[PDB]
Amino acid sequence: TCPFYKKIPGTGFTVDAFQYGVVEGCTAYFLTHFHSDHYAGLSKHFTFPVYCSEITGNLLKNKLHVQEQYIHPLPLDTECIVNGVKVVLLDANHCPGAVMILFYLPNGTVILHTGDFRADPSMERSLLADQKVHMLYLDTTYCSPEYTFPSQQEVIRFAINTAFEAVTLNPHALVVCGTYSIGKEKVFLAIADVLGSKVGMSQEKYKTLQCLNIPEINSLITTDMCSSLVHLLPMMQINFKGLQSHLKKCGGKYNQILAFRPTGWTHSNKFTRIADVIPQTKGNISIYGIPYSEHSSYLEMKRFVQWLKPQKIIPTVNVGTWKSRSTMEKYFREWKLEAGY
């Protein structure tokens, strides 16, 4: 059965609630983004209206084969009326097509659902600036002060400089980047751009990227692996065994692999600086873990919430343990006492 934190009170609406069968009273199912924990349950046999961004709707049609008549794409930054209630979709700074949803309830209550997001000061000059928010349904993935990581720009500068150095030293080195979902495309696009290459990948991944409305994409990617010196592989193949196997397949074109694993936060963040990160190496293979996050750090989260000043917070992540829930409630009260709302 559907948990309360996926329901929008005073409406017929649910958010990211596709794995519960028919939810009683739900007239429109919102999907914030195309990540499997959030779309879990959707298939080609789903027969209720789904409301989402254009990019998410492209993925629903081409990858999940949801039929067109049930997909309702909405433009961003635009007041829309759904089932008699005003909504706005805002960019979540997560993966391609990811949104936050503002609901303007008939009784005057305003609710923001962040979906998954990476809070940013630019959000303080969206349509959120214009009115008060009573209830915040919040992506609390990294809601504890130990969760620190660099900006996305610092992490990409590290990856560009590492790849450009290695390949300039050895023109016969291949670069490989792991992937298992949409998001984090800047990692492999930025490296291919510094190396003057397209990015090579499987037909299935090419198909997915062709749904994302990325400008000039046809100039940036390919299914011809032979022509490319940056390859994408499934994240599960980013280990010494998988990479050896891949180098075999390249027919002696290359004699070295430099590989990147974009992770979220890892405990090595509590000690090391990005500048100081080193790889794991075995022979002619090296593997870098790089902390490229598409969720808020603790500090980014706290700044957003202290700016927005909501009357009530409903967490949407880490809700399964009493210890997690108590920790998050303590920080919410700190933030509120510190800022005075």
Minimum distance, C-beta of residue 166 to Ni ion, in the bound complex (Å): 31
Nearer to Ni ion, 116 or 300 (CB): 116
Beta bridge partners of 88: 102
Minimum distance, C-beta of residue 320 to Ni ion, in the bound complex (Å): 17
Nearer to Ni ion, 35 or 118 (CB): 35
Minimum distance, C-beta of residue 55 to Ni ion, in the bound complex (Å): 14
Nearer to Ni ion, 228 or 293 (CB): 293
Number of residues that bind Ni ion (CB under 5 A): 2
Which stretch, 27-35, 45-53, 120-128, 310-318, contacts Ni ion (CB under 5 A)?
27-35
Q: Spell 281-311 as b/e; 16+ CB within 10 A means b.
A: eeebbbbbbbbbbbbbbbebbbbbbeebebe
Minimum distance, C-beta of residue 293 to Ni ion, in the bound complex (Å): 11
Which stretch, 29-37, 127-135, 198-206, 283-291, contacts Ni ion (CB under 5 A)?
29-37
Dihedral angle over CA of 224, 225, 229, 231, nearest 10: 120
Neighbour order of strands in the sheet with 230-234: 221-222, 199-200, 230-234, 173-179, 256-263, 285-291, 280-282
Interface with Ni ion includes 35 (CB under 5 A)? Answer: yes
Residue type, 14: T
Interface with Ni ion includes 300 (CB under 5 A)? Answer: no
Minimum distance, C-beta of residue 142 to Ni ion, in the bound complex (Å): 13
The CB-side HSE value for 87 (13 A sphere, CA atoms) comes to: 24
* CA 142 – CA 49 distance, rounded (Å): 32
Nearer to Ni ion, 35 or 303 (CB): 35
Interface with Ni ion includes 139 (CB under 5 A)? Answer: no
Which stretch, 52-60, 116-124, 192-200, 208-216, contacts Ni ion (CB under 5 A)?
116-124
Nearer to Ni ion, 37 or 329 (CB): 37
Nearer to Ni ion, 116 or 185 (CB): 116
Q: Which of 16, 31, 116, 158 binds Ni ion (CB under 5 A)?
A: 116
The CB-side HSE value for 146 (13 A sphere, CA atoms) comes to: 7
The contact pattern for Ni ion, residues 59-98, with x = CB under 5 A and - = no contact, is: ----------------------------------------
Which stretch, 103-111, 114-122, 192-200, 211-219, contacts Ni ion (CB under 5 A)?
114-122
Minimum distance, C-beta of residue 321 to Ni ion, in the bound complex (Å): 20
Nearer to Ni ion, 181 or 245 (CB): 181
Q: How far is CA 339 from CA 73, 148, 331, in A?
A: 38, 22, 12
Binding site for Ni ion (CB under 5 A): 35, 116
